Amino acid sequence: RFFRNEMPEFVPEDLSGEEETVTECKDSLTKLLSLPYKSFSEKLHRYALSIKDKVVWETWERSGKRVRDYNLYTGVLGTAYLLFKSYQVTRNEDDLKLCLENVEACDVASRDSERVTFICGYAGVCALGAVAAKCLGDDQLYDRYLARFRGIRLPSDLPYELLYGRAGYLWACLFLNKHIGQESISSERMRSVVEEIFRAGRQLGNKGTCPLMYEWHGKRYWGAAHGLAGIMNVLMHTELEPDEIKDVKGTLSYMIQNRFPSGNYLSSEGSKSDRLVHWCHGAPGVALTLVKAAQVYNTKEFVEAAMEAGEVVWSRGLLKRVGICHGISGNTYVFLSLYRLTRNPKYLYRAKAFASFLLDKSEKLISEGQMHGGDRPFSLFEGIGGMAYMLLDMNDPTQALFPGYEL
Ligand SMILES: [Zn+2]
């Protein structure tokens, strides 16, 4: 379920060339939407600082700096990452320091952990640690997180998907390497994870239909978090061979040709219900993946499919939940992604409308239960942590990357 999107479509025409139409309804929301970007982004920035502060209060100070959760998704690493994003935007070195203090606590709390991914496990802790240390200029701290990251091993048991599986660990490696700008994690190690991914996908899949196939919890999920999209997405970020490229292209075509009559995407193989429009399941996560296919492959099929997935988000993507995983902050990135790809200000405008909706309405909507605020209300993936993160990323919308998804 979604709020009906009755927000005004983007107007390309230069008006005013007045005169401001008198009978046109002008509330606080419409005034936000009309705002020129410079002051609109400054406004969202100030709001995001208050959210950020609130999140730091609750997850760090109130709790007396004690760490139970730890991971990016719902735990304290979500807070460190938000602090990191804030540092990236503001260059406030106190944000980076606090970041590192949160990481260190997460590290302590994550020994004994068997979680291996960026978003849900220990590779997330180590890769942020190492990147934050590099920014700070602390080489010894860097080596130390780098050694912990390099000690990670993958049970033959692991799944393939993003939250718990190999695409997830491999995502962390790509993230670490891109940011340091070095082969910090070994290219042979990353290539080996890739080959295991194609091996299993090819074994369970049929060259006739979907050339690559996976299962998590015995389910054949299509989406970003546990499905085909998230895996293909990660694979596009590495050096494929020609037949690997065909197989990734193939799996993505398969999904395009086989979506709902509404243009939304199935949660999992033969599902009979068109209901979810989330990053985790549905159009939003898949759109982000097609945008990436579009950038790498430059195919009409992918470009147009990405745009079409964007229309499903535009009409149904205004979820009654605030967050990144399955909410408005997370669906905003669909428009940001389309904007990065096309440079078409209509897509910026669409991200601007979802962000304005959240700033104008979210507090009121959450506090009277018409918007769900996340089970962990201050987490990165469920709570307002992710709204602050999205808000901060609007400051420089062409540099905005869905956290733990886009590289
Ligand atoms: Zn979700």
Curated annotation (Swiss-Prot):
Q: Name one GO cellular component term.
A: extrinsic component of membrane
Q: What is the lineage of its organism?
A: Eukaryota, Viridiplantae, Streptophyta, Embryophyta, Tracheophyta
| Membership in a protein family | Belongs to the LanC-like protein family.
Query: Which key words tag this protein in UniProt?
Result: Abscisic acid signaling pathway, Metal-binding, Zinc
The GO annotation for biological process reads:
abscisic acid-activated signaling pathway; carbohydrate metabolic process; maintenance of seed dormancy; peptide modification; regulation of abscisic acid-activated signaling pathway
Single GO term (MF): abscisic acid binding
Question: Which residues are Zn(2+)-binding?
Answer: 280, 325-326
Recorded hits in PANTHER family, A to Z, give:
LANC-LIKE PROTEIN, LANC-LIKE PROTEIN 3
Superkingdom of the source species? Eukaryota
Species annotation: Arabidopsis thaliana
Name of this chain's protein: LanC-like protein GCR2
Q: Is RNA-binding there in the keyword field?
A: no
Assembly description? May interact (via C-terminus) with GPA1.
Q: What's the short name of a Pfam family annotated to this entry?
A: LANC_like
InterPro entries on file: 6hp_glycosidase-like_sf, LANC-like, LanC-like_prot_euk
Give the residue spans that cross the bilayer.
none
Q: What happens when the gene is disrupted?
A: No visible phenotype under normal growth conditions. However, in growth conditions described in PubMed:17347412 mutant plants have decreased sensitivity to abscisic acid (ABA).
Q: What does this protein do?
A: May play a role in abscisic acid (ABA) signaling.
**Gene3D superfamilies named among the record's database cross-references:** 1.50.10.10
